[PDB]
């Protein structure tokens, strides 16, 4: 039972295939067309079924060439409205039928962002992009919006001829629209069964550049060159991921660099990973985000969480694989450095929510909780920490990677729970059950706060970061003159970011210290989004008024939630910038991503 879905569960019926025929109307801000669902009954004498929908307009439902009765239930907040369809003929178990639903989306669809030409790099054409994870596919089309159901799909998308449509599928040709010569139809095929949160669409003035044997990078023309360089390690990361997880089954691995309002660092849409342009640091330093999306091709897209309560299965294993990819490219001391950094991010999340907060539990009960509200670093970092702890307990990385590959093989094309994962772990490690029985399972999986055990981390690369952060924290006014640009000479960008994260954990620092840090290190000149984000938070929390315009600009010129949300929160918490923070949000709200707008609104207590 998926408590986030209002549709018939997988035990009643299952969608096997979706054939989508739609048209993108930029003037009306709507997607209109037909969703033809091939549904298999799992029960005898099946006479009706229920689908998830959210702000959809339904024109008609057609089965066997005739219109059928349907009814929309009362809206259940963020879950949308259930749509019950009356079947014309009762179905036997395993019988399949095709249900063709004619629909139209709302311009306020929570799955979509519509951009005017002014909001794009090129300034001549509009742009549209989707983001279905977790439960926004129901705001695009009627479906069993649950990851417990996997389906293949085909799609034909009509767009204005000057634009390009792309999807989470293999490109299957393009033709002029026969019904309209000012339009083009783009075709797509997804032959591997996927959960519907993996359905994705982009429409815009897109250009491509090849960067590997199975990879194109896509973006507006202005970002193509920078993107091709930034993500050049993609093929090398795919090869390592295949060695760790087994064959890459998806055919293509393309990357799409979205406009700055994209709310995540990356989204693992199959065949077409979506990424934020905030990765464009100019030195490939933020490539771990690509390693993470690549890893989801196994942990998440092949082996999927049965419900959102088990989201840590997708995230924890992906972060574990991501850190191994970067470890293979840059060494074991670097994997430990990132693992230790992740523990710090977990300390921060637990401090923010509070140690008894239910959102700090690894497995969360999402009945009546919007998954967008519950989203945090917890499933990523507490999930990673559990696997890293198990790796150490069980004999090391080579042994634990053997389990990860067997786990992917066992559960490929399926949707599983925490209990399915735990049972297989016990089965694989049957000769080490005495070791497994020492794990405090109740605490790790179901208790709030920090986990009961902290793993062992090599500190080689972290030492210089801690040492410099401690010099600044313990410094008095008479020590400020001892700091100089030479303090940073032997630090990588990763180490500079970690020095800032360590210092930010002890913020505020005195205003004189922050001013000195700018005087000697010129952090205001750094373009790297992660470093700039932590530096600005440190400035604002330390009450530097000069940083207010810089923090407001970063919070609005991009929309990656990881940055926008804490920047707005820090600005609202500083008396000097409070009013500016609220006004800026109110002015930008109408042109923000709908999910980001809702979350920033809640964080600021502005309705
Ligand atoms: Yb074809
Ligand atoms: Yb002193
Ligand atoms: Zn992820």
Numbering used by the authors: 4 to 610
Publication excerpt:
LTA4H catalyzes the final and rate limiting step in the biosynthesis of pro-inflammatory LTB4, that is, the vinylogous hydrolysis of the epoxide, LTA4. LTA4 binds to a deep L-shaped hydrophobic channel which forms one of two lobes of the catalytic site of the enzyme. The second lobe of the catalytic site of LTA4H is a more open and hydrophilic pocket, and forms the aminopeptidase activity of the enzyme. While less is known about the physiological relevance of the aminopeptidase activity of LTA4H, Snelgrove and co-workers suggested that it can degrade the tripeptide PGP which has been reported to be a collagen-derived matrikine and neutrophil chemoattractant.
Overlaying the structure of LTA4H bound JNJ-26993135 (compound 11) to that of PGP bound in the active site showed that simultaneous binding of the two ligands would not be possible due to steric effects. However, we hypothesized that by removing the part of the compound which interacts with the Zn2+, we would be able to have simultaneous binding of the PGP and the truncated compound to LTA4H. On the other hand, in the exudate of the LTA4H KO mice, over 80% of the PGP was still present even after 24 h, suggesting that LTA4H is the dominant enzyme for degradation of PGP in vivo. In both exudates, Ac-PGP remained as stable over 24 h at 37 °C as in PBS. This indicated that, as already observed by others, LTA4H cannot degrade the acetylated version of PGP. Although LTA4H is the dominant enzyme that can degrade PGP in vivo, the physiological relevance of this activity seems highly questionable.
